[PDB]
Design a protein around this ligand. Structure first.
Ligand SMILES: NCc1csc(-c2cccs2)n1
Ligand SMILES: [Ca+2]
Length: 223
């Protein structure tokens, strides 16, 4: 997250870190057994780390649970990033509590102008590189479809929205991918892509979660 703020330990209780020897992506806990992330974060050998604040120090609220199964969306295209969503099932159920909690799925799509919270352990610089230990947060609005398309001609599908600041300075970045965009207590986005971070006229692009609720529910119901 570039241009954000320190969230505070365990104030984003649905935020998980995906670890394969090291943090590599975010995700969002949606029930005691299942995490939402980005399909471009797929790999084998994932350990899900819940209850994290400083991802390099054991602080006492973590739960580490290995994935039993990953399911990439049926229509994911890794060239266009269309349908950039996957589900990850945990080998055992997380203990839910005030610091490890699931986030509700949307019941309708959010509109441009809605305020949201984006969070993650990604890079905090727009030139160069610095990775934080503790979780970073950014409040950002959803941008209109039309400004998102004009920002990225030929690349925004109906399964994507933009959020952030056309002026630049405040955005998600590398290592945030797969993490949450939560608006009014609902998971409306997943950190997906952009062109650099925090550049003028290049806001972040996010997977539009409301399009996937019936796939998420039916997948959980049978897996
Ligand atoms: N600035 C939005 C965004 C989200 S993930 C991402 C990057 C991935 C790799 C380099 S940068 N950028
Ligand atoms: Ca920790």
């Amino acid at each position: 997250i570039v241009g954000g703020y320190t969230c505070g330990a365990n104030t984003v209780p649905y935020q998980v870190s995906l670890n394969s020897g090291y943090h590599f992506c975010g995700g969002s806990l949606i029930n005691s057994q299942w995490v939402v992330s980005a399909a471009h974060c797929y790999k084998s050998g994932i350990q899900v780390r819940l209850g994290e604040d400083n991802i390099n120090v054991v602080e006492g609220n973590e739960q580490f649970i290995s994935a039993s199964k990953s399911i990439v969306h049926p229509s994911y295209n890794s060239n266009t990033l269309n349908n950039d969503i996957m589900l990850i099932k945990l080998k055992s159920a997380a203990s839910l509590n005030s610091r490890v909690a699931s986030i509700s799925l949307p019941t309708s799509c959010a509109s441009a102008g809605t305020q949201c919270l984006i969070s993650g352990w990604g890079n905090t610089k727009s030139s160069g590189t610095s990775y934080p230990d503790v979780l970073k947060c950014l409040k950002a609005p959803i941008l209109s479809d039309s400004s998102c398309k004009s920002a990225y001609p030929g690349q925004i599908t109906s399964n994507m929205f933009c959020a952030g600041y056309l002026e630049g300075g405040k955005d998600s970045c590398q290592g945030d991918s797969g993490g949450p965009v939560v608006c009014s207590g609902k998971l409306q986005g997943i950190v997906s892509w952009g062109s650099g971070c925090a550049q003028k006229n290049k806001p972040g692009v996010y997977t539009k979660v409301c399009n996937y609720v019936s796939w998420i529910k039916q997948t959980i119901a049978s897996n």
